Symmetry: C3
Amino acid sequence: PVYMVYVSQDRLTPSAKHAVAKAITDAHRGLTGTQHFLAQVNFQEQPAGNVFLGGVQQGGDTIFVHGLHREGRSADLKGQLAQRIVDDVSVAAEIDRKHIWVYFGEMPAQQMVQYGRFLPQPGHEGEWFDNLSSDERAFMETNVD
Amino acid sequence: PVYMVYVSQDRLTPSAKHAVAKAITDAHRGLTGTQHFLAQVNFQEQPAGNVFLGGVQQGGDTIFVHGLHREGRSADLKGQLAQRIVDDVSVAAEIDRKHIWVYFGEMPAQQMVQYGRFLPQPGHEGEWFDNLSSDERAFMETNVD
Amino acid sequence: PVYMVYVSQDRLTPSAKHAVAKAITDAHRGLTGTQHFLAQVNFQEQPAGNVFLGGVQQGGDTIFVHGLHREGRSADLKGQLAQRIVDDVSVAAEIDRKHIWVYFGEMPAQQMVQYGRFLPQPGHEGEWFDNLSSDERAFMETNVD
């Protein structure tokens, strides 16, 4: 998946960003079975005061997670995954759950590309990984924490 | 909803940002009945010259609005809401409507989280809010302009 | 289309951005017939270190293209389109294709606004263009490269 994480400038130190990224990745690995190295977390920092709720300008405390996944998982699984991201980003970012927004969008795996390769259907990541060239496997395997 | 609003750096003052967020938020409230505080406007600023149209580098005058909504509304209501966003942002930003792009994407409300909670289906936002806890209501209620 | 292109600050010079924007725009025009001026490429720079793969912090050499299209094209075409964006951005940015990720999302055309107007269905674009006012047609032509 690709998790776009919209935060304020300097709300997360390099260490907190790392912890939030592990937490999102670990929740996704644990609830779906997708390998660590297939999950991207992309932080988008903007100056504080660029978020408005109900038209009221906010401080640096909001977090919006926009998760981009492939189709095929149940609504039950996606709800569990959304809820664990709320809980685990709360802890990792030391941020109250009330400050956290999370949206999941889905598209066919047939129009999703990671590492220059088309993605398999969810559940089939063992295959697909095994049918990748040695260089590609080794290169993906560096992205495990 | 979350409205991602992509604009050039310094093209909007704090006050014009404030006006554009209000124009979008009031458009959403007015046409959907959703409470002001459920609508997020998130400004994404980038240096001028980062937008290209047909391969031609642009100035600072482009606005792209990516609106993320719950499924369940009619195509007619979504058209009126996109047109109202074009018109009222044009006035609040003092930018010609020919510079404005608006895209609406939808997701099932079961995979959408705001203020740490899952959204209800479009309509009965009222019985949903009333059933949040006292402190969640008090926190949400402060974000109304 | 809007192609959101997420890169690290300073990985692409002004000329490289033009090349990447041209490669994406020529590929979209190439396979769908949608005229040049109807394709936005929108670069979102962030400092290096804001991207994590499998929880591991990345250097400055990653690219994520989020392409936002209208509905109505076939899976086969969308597949060719994404493959061509991978190859042509690899060349244009001088980056190995293992570093490239591309997701396509789609929306109904009736909830997609460009140049202040609603889009037509994915094959009815010349006639849409003719029915515009000459003023709107003129503003549109100045954006072809």
